[PDB]
């Protein structure tokens, strides 16, 4: 019982840590994606001009 409780607490804490890490990584990926796509749109606008 003690081992199961400790393992569960550790698993939950690690889950929260990994969720935070993956969420912030996804936010960074979204930022970079937006920047790259804005650059691509700017190139398209220059082509239209």
């Amino acid at each position: 019982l003690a081992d199961a409780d400790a393992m569960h607490a550790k698993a939950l804490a690690d889950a929260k840590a990994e969720s935070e890490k993956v969420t912030e990584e996804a936010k960074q990926d979204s930022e970079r994606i937006a920047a790259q796509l804005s650059e691509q749109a700017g190139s398209e606008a220059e082509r239209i001009k």
Partner: protein, 237 residues
């Protein structure tokens, strides 16, 4: 002399030696077959002239395999010499593997090896699909074929393969753009570049959703209902 008409035309498309400037002319003759009869006179004439053929099917096109290349019959007679080192390394035997996969799929229409072959072939067929007016730079093609042949699509469901590919490419374009730069500049995939790409793929797999969201990481009528009974020789109680 109808064969001569096309033979002397297509033989002018050549690759000149350095002594003549090193210029080249690549030919993409188009031939229309009727009822998928490549045995007609003109198609057979031309097929025997050119340095390979890309043979397109209405059947494959309608199945969603677009471009509708018949892998088994389509060939290039230049081969690896017409590819950069990285493409050769990743696409070394892709065409042969797809031909074997089509053969097996027709046969198996089953041991573990056959299951694995069918799964990989389905994933590769999905990988080679491509919309119109959506060109892929050679480095991006190298990375996509690397996803395919190196087995990184095995965990991904077939229906998601395409999407996966696109997303992953976008990722590599948004971050880790030095992989594409290395492939484009050096014309080859370095061992450390390969390791970085594998690590990037494995990391990206954590944040990817399948169609079902799964992880890619690693009235009868009672009267008709006959009733069993026990026969008993007693008066109705």
């Amino acid at each position: 002399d109808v064969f001569y008409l096309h033979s002397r035309l297509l033989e002018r498309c050549a690759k000149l030696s350095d002594e003549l400037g090193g210029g080249s002319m690549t030919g993409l003759p188009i031939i229309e077959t009727k009822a998928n009869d490549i045995s007609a006179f003109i198609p057979t004439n031309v097929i025997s002239i050119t340095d390979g053929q890309c043979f397109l099917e209405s059947d494959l096109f309608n199945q969603g395999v677009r471009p509708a290349i018949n892998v088994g019959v389509s060939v290039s007679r230049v081969g690896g010499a017409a590819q950069i080192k990285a493409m050769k390394e990743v696409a070394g035997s892709l065409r042969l593997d797809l031909s074997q996969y089509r053969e097996l799929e027709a046969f198996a229409a089953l041991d573990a090896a056959s299951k694995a072959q069918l799964d990989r072939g389905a994933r590769l067929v999905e990988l080679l699909k491509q919309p119109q007016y959506s060109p892929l730079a050679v480095e991006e093609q190298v990375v996509a074929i690397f996803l395919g042949t190196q087995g990184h699509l095995d965990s991904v469901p077939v229906e998601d393969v395409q999407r996966f590919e696109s997303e992953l490419l976008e990722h590599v374009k948004a971050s880790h753009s030095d992989i594409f730069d290395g492939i484009r500049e050096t014309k080859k995939l370095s061992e450390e570049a390969e390791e970085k790409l594998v690590s990037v793929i494995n990391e990206f797999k954590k944040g990817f959703q399948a169609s079902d969201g799964s992880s890619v990481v690693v009235a009868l009528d009672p009267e008709d209902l006959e009733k069993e009974s026990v026969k008993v020789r007693k008066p109705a109680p």
